[PDB]
Assembly symmetry: D2
Homo-oligomer: 326 residues x 4
């Protein structure tokens, strides 16, 4: 289960925040992909192709598939799990894309939430991955994106049929249930106020109401030196302890890492639970030229970065997305 929230500050101040929780280690890493690069939405299926128009920084999943990142044009994307997401019924002859690269496609071809919604509602392809290949627990997610202007759009495939809700009023997103209900739930908690009562359980829906109430009670300021820690605080509030385990639940999904993107100033921020220090990357201080080279920022070996870990950027081989089932 994961959550993501977006802050709408004065003077185009847009800062997004995404959570990462998983049962075991995620082995995620940060890769930087300049523009002018082509990719295939799938390797063993009929698929579409494109050409990376913008550079961006994203967080990987075991070095297999992107699930969060921010592009040059202050636009951030995030994939959160949704236990009731189906992408297509039989009879789909469209170019089958794979859920592993769904994220990467959008960031490489979009810079404004408006434009992204347009091409998506064409359903020009079906994006899928086989079920429980590695005996995994679940394998179904939904994505959220936001531009440096403050507009956001939640996307979910309802048993094959896409389901999208666009607008700036929608700035938080958890796992389950369906958003229309996920939001309807909050209607009840808002009347009971947040101060006089606030549910502290860890269920997917519970994490939603908390973020909603706090992300508004936060100070309405356009400055960037303060909003960043403010966004992370609620991320820490919504974040859950690591290594939890009760008699009923033998193993649990713990808070592994979180991400925040200063979409107004184009600065991505990333933190790991088992790390003491906080680092960041300034996209404006990054050469996304067509021929700049792929520099990786590894985190598996437990490296400890901090500050502007741009000097620590090392040229590395872009992780190969996985559409097979092994």
């Amino acid at each position: 289960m994961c959550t993501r929230a977006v802050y709408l500050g004065p003077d185009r101040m847009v800062v997004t925040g995404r959570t990462m929780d998983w049962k075991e280690d995620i082995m995620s890493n940060i890769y930087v992909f300049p523009r002018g690069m082509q990719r295939a939405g799938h390797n063993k299926e009929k698929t579409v192709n494109w050409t990376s128009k913008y550079g961006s920084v994203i967080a990987t999943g075991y070095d297999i598939g992107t699930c969060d990142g921010m592009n040059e044009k202050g636009l951030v994307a995030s994939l959160l799990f949704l236990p009731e997401s189906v992408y297509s019924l039989p009879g789909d002859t469209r170019p089958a894309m794979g859920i592993s690269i769904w994220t990467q496609y959008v960031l490489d071809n979009f810079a404004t939430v408006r434009e992204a919604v347009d091409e998506m509602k064409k359903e020009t392809f079906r994006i899928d991955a086989p079920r429980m290949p590695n005996g995994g627990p679940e394998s179904t997610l939904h994505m959220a994106i936001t531009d440096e202007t403050g507009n956001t759009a939640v996307i979910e495939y309802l048993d094959g049929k896409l389901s999208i809700h666009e607008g700036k009023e929608y700035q938080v997103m958890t796992n389950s249930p369906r958003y229309e209900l996920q939001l309807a739930v909050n209607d009840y908690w808002k009347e009971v106020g947040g101060l006089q009562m606030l549910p502290g359980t860890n269920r997917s829906s519970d994490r939603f109401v908390r973020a909603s109430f706090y992300i508004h009670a936060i100070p309405q300021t356009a400055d960037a030196k303060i909003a960043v820690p403010s966004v992370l605080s609620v991320m820490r509030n919504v974040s859950v302890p690591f290594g939890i385990n009760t008699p009923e639940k033998p193993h649990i999904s713990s808070t592994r890492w979180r991400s925040v993107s200063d979409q107004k100033n184009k600065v991505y921020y990333f933190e790991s639970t088992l790390t003491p220090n906080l680092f960041w990357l300034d996209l404006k201080k990054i050469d996304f030229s067509p021929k700049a080279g792929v520099k990786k920022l590894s985190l598996t070996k437990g490296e400890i970065y901090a500050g502007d870990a741009v000097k620590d950027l090392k040229d590395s081989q872009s992780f190969t997305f996985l559409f097979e089932t092994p």
Copy 2:
């Protein structure tokens, strides 16, 4: 306001943490006090003196009085808030140890909760509480002491009469009401189970229940690299958001920093709500010799640190405790 809890792990692993919530800036700092330092419990009233037994690292608040820290013997003490507090009735005439140095006196002259339990129950000195009318809240608090053995003790002068609670079970504590109630109220939610319901509200009791439930659920492991993060994680959870304001409730005490101690290894980790990195100080690499010098680690000007901030210490003169209500801002 704040919230404190203690973790009890195998292999003598006992990690304690603390939270700090304030409506404005605390302007806290950090100072070092080698052993063998005489001190007076007050500058103008009849109070005892002493010479620091064990060197102690303490975190200051406004550079007037220590609010939390440690000493040379895995003895971590913290001072939280409590409105319904009364230290003495009209007529008390004992030595009135100012509240500003009460904690420091403890860390200085104690290394085990059992000892402090004794010297405390002697009821030798009163507690001096200054009163101020211009934007100042009267001093009404309580304290908690934990030993590297894992034994904890709660102290609170309830309506002029002090009540102490010792034991290893007693590991969590928050603002109000009195622990006699807070502990029992929590037992209610215990029935409900944390997985199913938990008062996520920022209120005192709400935080107490959440900390109590999670502190057990966290991993019980003897390794420090794992238990420490598992601790601060609940610290951030119990910690309320930063700078919350509502039209009805305009100002609210917001979190300003968190403190964690590895009493099993004598380490102190510190982070601020406005400081991204997490620095620490290895007490073992310290020298508390009587003539080692008072060392300060300023933070008023917003200095930034990370890792082990041993090299970045600068000797300075001891701060000045506050025993009498300030005349004005």
Copy 3:
């Protein structure tokens, strides 16, 4: 705000329960209407007409409009307030019916939930009443009906467009919000269980979850001597104290009366808060012949009935429904 719940007992055991709460006195009464009677869906508007096919007993509203009742064929109807119910936008040339008689129409022309749904989805008319005529607080409701078989159908007009949900799994109904959300809310409370935690507030949505969990934990028995009090208990649980008043809320809507219908055995049950005793009426012990006469069962003057208040039935003039705005 009002609530209604339906019990599905073994061997076609169907018993419905409806709540009544209002700010001040309701001045309601119980009228019996045999079959073979004609009515007009509105007096000053183009309207449809029919001929009462079955007899039934209903509870009136100030002696102006029916809001609850049970027919011969063990089918019960109930109108509950819904603050977000609109019945038609401009351009409605259909026979305008009035919200006051909407209830009476269904009971007089239906005996099975299936048949009722059919004719309703024709939208052959618009049923409306002018807004705040007597300075009233609100004036928008939704209806729930159930046959002696156990099938129920909730109905709500979404800004003119009807909204219906049919099935036996839907046996409880409160005021707000919309049902699709009103039910989605319960999804959260069911996971938290009812025993280990149950919200006791009085808001419309809160009253829903309580009834849902209890109406299932109740014993699954086909006997009728016990299920009746069981249904009323939750009605008492969902029922709220009378004359409540805090500093914030100066006057409140108190629990005035409740109703339960033994749809399997065709027996209607009614209780008033300010009355000590409980009475009932056995439809099977009632002559709904075309020419039987209208016998009223008054309750305004605070009469105190009990037991089988059929002997207390007195021939009276059927209350005239109100479509005007005075």
Copy 4:
């Protein structure tokens, strides 16, 4: 289990009600006892005797011992449950008044809480608790007494030591834990406000909070016709559903009947969960003369009544209290 609360209205209006929840049938009944009836606090142990001062209407449980009632002086007493109860420590040798007649002895020999407060604090007699191993829960309860003046008192033998709480504020009481905690826990929800949140759960504390909040919100009126229904309304609210069963929690104590008293007018209203009408008995129309005769109003066979059930009383012999653990069913 059960739950009790007291309403305080102007013009000396004080209406008290009670709830009864049991896993099976209580087989309760009703009996009348005119004044001037000698009684012994036990049949086989050393116990005091007495002669009933004030006639008292009591509701029996299994026709063995009174669980609630009243006397000739607007003095309504009730007996609720409490697991963590201890009446005396090993070695007590005082008069051991059986728990079955403790209540009756009170109503018989008292007319004001102040008096009972005195005679009770004398600590003259112990409490006899029988122990049974076959489907029987050991007797562990507490009591509450209210006077027509509106003053209430809570009594509970906590770990062999009795603790009393008197006053007009103390009007609500439930199962567990001890009122010292139950009262304070409720103060928590008080913060949350009843309109915004209320633990609708059937648990002991949940019911206590709901009753406390609503009992104030109900109409404060001097007329009986209005206050009485406003009372029983909260009684039904606090009352848990009937015959609840879950696969995990199979059997649960369900509500069986509710009792209300108009202490200002000396009336007793009674209803059963399986009885639709609400009958009552006007104590004023009663004769408790010493030789008036013990009168019973049976309910085992499920008789049905309504209105004022004065005419439908049938004289019978007094029931038999239980002082010793029954040999078997």
